C-alpha cells in the first residue's frame, strides 16, 4: 500500500515487495530471506534509503527513511582501519548481516 | 658369539608374547591372565589407529607391527647396562636394513628411477621440473632412511651419556655420595626427559613416513 507512491512510475525499478506484510507478524528470518537475494542487484549504495514508519507510539510513528550504507568502499576508507582488520568480506558480511537485522527491524517498525 | 646371538632372539621374543596372546583371547578364558595382557594390543589398536586410515585398511596392520617393534626394542635397551654403547648400536645397525627396505617394498621395488611417483607426485618435489624430483628423492627417501638409523642412535647417544657422565661423576667424587648426588639426581631425571620422550617421537617418524608413501600410492 506503499506501492502506490512508487507504483505508477515503475513496476520494474522495484526489486521486491513483501507480501503477507505482518499477518503472522513479520520476522527476522524473513528479514534475512528478503535480505539475501536483494544483495544481488546492481545498485548497491546509490545509497538506499529505507523508509518505514518508525513508531513513536501505537498511534504514531513517523514515516521514516534511513540511509543504506552499502559502501564497503568509503567505509573501506577512513576510521575503519581502527577496526584493525575487518575485511570486505566480514564488512560486507556484516553489512549483509545488518541488512537483515535492520530489515527485520524496519519491517517491524 | 653367544652374546650377540642371545640378544636378537630376546628382542624377537618380547614382541612375540603379545602377538601370540591376542589371537588366543578370542573366546577363552580369561581369568586374570588373558584379560591382563589383552590391553597391550588394545592400547596399540587405540593409540596408533587415531592416525591410520588415512592410507586405508590394507596397509595398516603391516606397519603397526614395525611401529610397536621399534618402541619395544628401544625399551629393551633402556634398563640393561652395559648395553647402549655396543649392543644397542649393533641393533641400530641390524634395524638399519629393515628401515631402508621399508621404502623398497612399495616405492623402489615398483619404481626405482622415480619412487616419488608412488610417494608424493606434487608437493615437495616439483612435478614441472623432473630435475628437482630426482634431487629431492634423496631428501624424501635416501637420507630419511639413513636418518631413521640415526633416529634410534640419538636416543642411544643421550641414554648413553646419562650413564657415562653418571659413572664418571661418582668416580671423580667417590665421596659416598656426596656432592655427586646433586648432579646424579639430575642425570636420572634426564632419562624421562630424554629417552621416554624421544623414543615415542621415534616411532611417530616411522608412522608418518610410511603413511605418506602408501596414502599417495
Amino acid at each position: 500500500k506503499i506501492r502506490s507512491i512508487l507504483h505508477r512510475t515503475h513496476s520494474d525499478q522495484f526489486l521486491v515487495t513483501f507480501k503477507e506484510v505482518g499477518r503472522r507478524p513479520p520476522t527476522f528470518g524473513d528479514a534475512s530471506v528478503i535480505a539475501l537475494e536483494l544483495l544481488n542487484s546492481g545498485y548497491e549504495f546509490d545509497e538506499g534509503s529505507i523508509i518505514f514508519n518508525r513508531f513513536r507510539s501505537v498511534i504514531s510513528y513517523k514515516t521514516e527513511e534511513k540511509p543504506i550504507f552499502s559502501l564497503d568502499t568509503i567505509s573501506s576508507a577512513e576510521s575503519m582501519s581502527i577496526y584493525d582488520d575487518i575485511d570486505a568480506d566480514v564488512l560486507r558480511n556484516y553489512q549483509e548481516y545488518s541488512l537483515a537485522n535492520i530489515i527485520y527491524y524496519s519491517l517491524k517498525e | 658369539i653367544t652374546p650377540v646371538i642371545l640378544g636378537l632372539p630376546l628382542v624377537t621374543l618380547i614382541v612375540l608374547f603379545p602377538s601370540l596372546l591376542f589371537p588366543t583371547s578370542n573366546r577363552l578364558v580369561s581369568n586374570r591372565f588373558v584379560t591382563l595382557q589383552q590391553w597391550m594390543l588394545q592400547l596399540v589398536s587405540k593409540q596408533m589407529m587415531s592416525i591410520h586410515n588415512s592410507k586405508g585398511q590394507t596397509w595398516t596392520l603391516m606397519l603397526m607391527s614395525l611401529i610397536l617393534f621399534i618402541g619395544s626394542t628401544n625399551l629393551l635397551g633402556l634398563l640393561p647396562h652395559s648395553f647402549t654403547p655396543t649392543t644397542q648400536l649393533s641393533m641400530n645397525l641390524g634395524m638399519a636394513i629393515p628401515l631402508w627396505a621399508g621404502a623398497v617394498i612399495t616405492g623402489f621395488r615398483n619404481k626405482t628411477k622415480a619412487s616419488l611417483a608412488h610417494f608424493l607426485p606434487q608437493g615437495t618435489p616439483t612435478p614441472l621440473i623432473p630435475m628437482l624430483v630426482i634431487i629431492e628423492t634423496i631428501s624424501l627417501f635416501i637420507q630419511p632412511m639413513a636418518l631413521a638409523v640415526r633416529l634410534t642412535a640419538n636416543i642411544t647417544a643421550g641414554h648413553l651419556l646419562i650413564h657415562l657422565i653418571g659413572g664418571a661423576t661418582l668416580a671423580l667424587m667417590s665421596i659416598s655420595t656426596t656432592t655427586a648426588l646433586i648432579t646424579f639426581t639430575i642425570l636420572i631425571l634426564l632419562t624421562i626427559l630424554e629417552f621416554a620422550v624421544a623414543m615415542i617421537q621415534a616411532y611417530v617418524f616411522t608412522l608418518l613416513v610410511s603413511l605418506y608413501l602408501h596414502d599417495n600410492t
Binding site: - | 630376546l10 584379560t35 590391553w39 588394545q42 653418571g166 636420572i188
Partner: protein
C-alpha cells in the same frame, strides 16, 4: 602382578650377563624405577578404569 615380577627378574638376569660397571649405572636406573612405583600406582588406577570396562562394553 606376577607377570611384572617375572619381567623384572628377566631384566636383572640380562644385566648380570651384560654389566659394564657396578654402581653409577645402577644408581641411574634405580632412581628411574623408584619414581615409577609411586607414579605407577596413580597410572594403574587409570589403567584399571579403562580396560575391564572397555572389554565389557565391546
Amino acid at each position: 602382578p606376577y607377570v611384572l615380577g617375572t619381567g623384572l627378574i628377566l631384566y636383572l638376569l640380562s644385566k648380570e650377563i651384560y654389566v659394564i660397571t657396578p654402581e653409577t649405572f645402577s644408581a641411574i636406573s634405580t632412581i628411574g624405577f623408584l619414581v615409577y612405583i609411586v607414579k605407577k600406582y596413580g597410572a594403574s588406577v587409570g589403567e584399571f578404569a579403562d580396560k575391564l570396562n572397555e572389554q565389557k562394553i565391546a
